[PDB]
């Protein structure tokens, strides 16, 4: 997963 920081881990 290459998600933005505020996304859920």
């Amino acid at each position, epitope marked *: 997963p*290459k*998600l*933005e*920081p*505020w*996304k*859920h881990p």
Partner: antibody
Amino acid sequence: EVKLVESGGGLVKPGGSLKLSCAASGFAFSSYDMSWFCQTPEKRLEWVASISSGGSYTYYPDSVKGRFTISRDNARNTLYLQMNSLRSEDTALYYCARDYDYGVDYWGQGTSVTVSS
Amino acid sequence: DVVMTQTPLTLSVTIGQPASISCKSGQSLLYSDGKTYLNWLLQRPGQSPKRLIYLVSKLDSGVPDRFTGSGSGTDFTLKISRVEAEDLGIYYCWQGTHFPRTFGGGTKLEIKR
């Protein structure tokens, strides 16, 4: 090729509801976070909603939180935005988008919403 | 919440010639993870937004290397080494480090004649 075709826009009254749809094809829909954006008639872009690939997590700016609901039918490759308590300000062109590569990589074509009495 | 200020508002430019556009954030886009979530997108007239840049400088693979994104902190630049006819449109920068995502206001790119 990745493809996103939004539908459901039209004229609604202030206070009303409208549910938008986004038919996704050409990729494994259920493996990606999805989003909604809008472009106001003066061409401001704005973030509207995001949902985790699985559908567990949903996220909203304060301006839509409580009013709008994002969800998805993975079995059926579709993204949704149930909009309630519409106000003139939500008058925009609404875009479905795919969240990948530390942001957003694809945009659909847009469906147009006007909130007016 | 994070303010994104793009400058100039429109820019007329010349087929063959370079161009640059600027985008400032009211606050740092650097995340406590080393990665900077600063994006560029193009909307051509009547078309849908098209990713151009992500993480400051990574090029979308449909886009030619004529375009380079750079900057750090609060200042970023999109530059076009030589402008073609199809570069016409609105360029937006946008941030996804801080919740909620926010957008700059758009730089309209125009062609001289």
